[PDB]
Amino acid sequence: SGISLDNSYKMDYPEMGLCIIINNKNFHKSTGMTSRSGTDVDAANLRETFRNLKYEVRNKNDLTREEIVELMRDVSKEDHSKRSSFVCVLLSHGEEGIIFGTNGPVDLKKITNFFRGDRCRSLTGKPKLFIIQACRGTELDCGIET
Amino acid sequence: SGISLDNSYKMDYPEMGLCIIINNKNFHKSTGMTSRSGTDVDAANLRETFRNLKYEVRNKNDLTREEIVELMRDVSKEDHSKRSSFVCVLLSHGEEGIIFGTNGPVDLKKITNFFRGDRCRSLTGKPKLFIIQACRGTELDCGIET
Amino acid sequence: HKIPVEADFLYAYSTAPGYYSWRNSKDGSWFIQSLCAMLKQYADKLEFMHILTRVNRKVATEFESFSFDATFHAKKQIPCIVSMLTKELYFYH
Amino acid sequence: HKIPVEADFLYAYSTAPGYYSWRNSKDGSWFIQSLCAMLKQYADKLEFMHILTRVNRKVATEFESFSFDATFHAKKQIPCIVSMLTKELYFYH
Ligand SMILES: *CC(=O)[C@H](Cc1ccccc1)NS(=O)(=O)c1ccc(C)cc1
Ligand SMILES: *CC(=O)[C@H](Cc1ccccc1)NS(=O)(=O)c1ccc(C)cc1
What we know:
The complex is a heterotetramer, with two copies of chain A (146 residues) and two copies of chain C (93 residues).
Chain A: E1 15-23, H1 39-51, E2 56-61, H2 65-76, E3 83-91, E4 94-95, E5 98-101, E6 104-107, H3 108-113, E7 128-133, E8 144-145
Parallel strand pairs in A: 1-2, 1-3, 3-7
Antiparallel strand pairs in A: 4-5, 5-6
Chain C: E1 2-3, E2 9-13, E3 23-24, E4 28-29, H1 30-42, H2 48-62, E5 80-83
Antiparallel strand pairs in C: 2-5, 3-4
Helix pairs in contact in C: 1-2
């Protein structure tokens, strides 16, 4: 055939892939964490948005740190051979490098490691997107008038 | 005039801007740091590459942590009104969030803070590019055969 | 013959490293509101990094906090695109 | 009426967070070699994020360490693009 340039990911697999949305609104009292009002708005917006992009959306609500890890592990063990990509959206409280389960923290590295090129072979060479809506610290940006 | 879309930075100012290259090869014995052989190759490659992009290149070699901070401060105090952007390239040893002067560390945040939109008004709204060639930790990527 | 195990990951953070991330109890978080809006408008037109750049601009320019607490009043936010991707990404083909 | 003080910054890291950054005593660092090569070839043709994506692919596919020390042998590297930019960036006009 003619000149072939591989500058863009192959996104014409039978399926676009999974879109896992973890929406944590209520946190255990002992964590001292307050609720995240309005987060359901985000969850619904994301579900519709990715549905229109043809992603197989799976919404999960109020997952403990143990459930988040179990979920990610199980998802990374699925056969993604016929999927073009993978998307995971995390909506919760957080700190730099950490996302919170309803009962405690989960290191983002622990979550993403399940999808490393050597640990999830059916996603090797395919885009793995992690969308994170959570604080990464306490700093506030005062901005500057333009 | 016709429809105006501001989707790209205005890069037609009289000058493209400065390109500051800090090349640290030799480190003080007390730091326990070894030399970085071949780093001059990078420094020269960058100088020529950015020269062709019309940047005013300034190469600096073996700067102490005090000199790096002084340099960044002074540069951020210049009048960049007629410049489209700013580029700073750091070549040295490093750790996550840290770049090394010949005699000690410099937090990357301390360097970039001088250029915040509220601290360097002549660069507000203009792209500020920091190119960092330095370790961000000790981890090694084993890779995966494709 | 090999690729990095960390390659082909894209992390779309709602805020810059070390920073707070803003949300509106009624309209949702600033970042997700903007991300969904830009995907809806540009997913069949622009490469993903360019869509996310539009998200950065939307969050940076159209949002500002309002609080009775001076500490949290009139604050701004800039999202943070972290790409380890090796190719351009288009949701369409 | 305001923009974030952290807006309009682009950090082109040679490696992923927490990782080692490779250099060749003769050809220079993997990242800078690749960055300069891609800028020379694409600066008058592609938007900056797309140039950096090519850099990511070049470093990820064309380089692998060789060491007598098994600990540092056959290792790979992926650069890390961190963008807080609010617009597309072209070096030409
Ligand atoms: C922005 C954010 O999520 C937190 C709010 C929070 C999160 C978890 C539990 C309680 C409250 N705000 S923060 O200013 O980033 C922060 C507050 C408290 C700690 C211990 C760390 C960070
Ligand atoms: C990759 C890198 O720059 C360092 C080498 C180094 C840097 C400064 C001083 C001595 C040696 N390697 S590292 O594995 O990332 C590392 C080595 C030693 C410390 C204390 C931190 C990180």
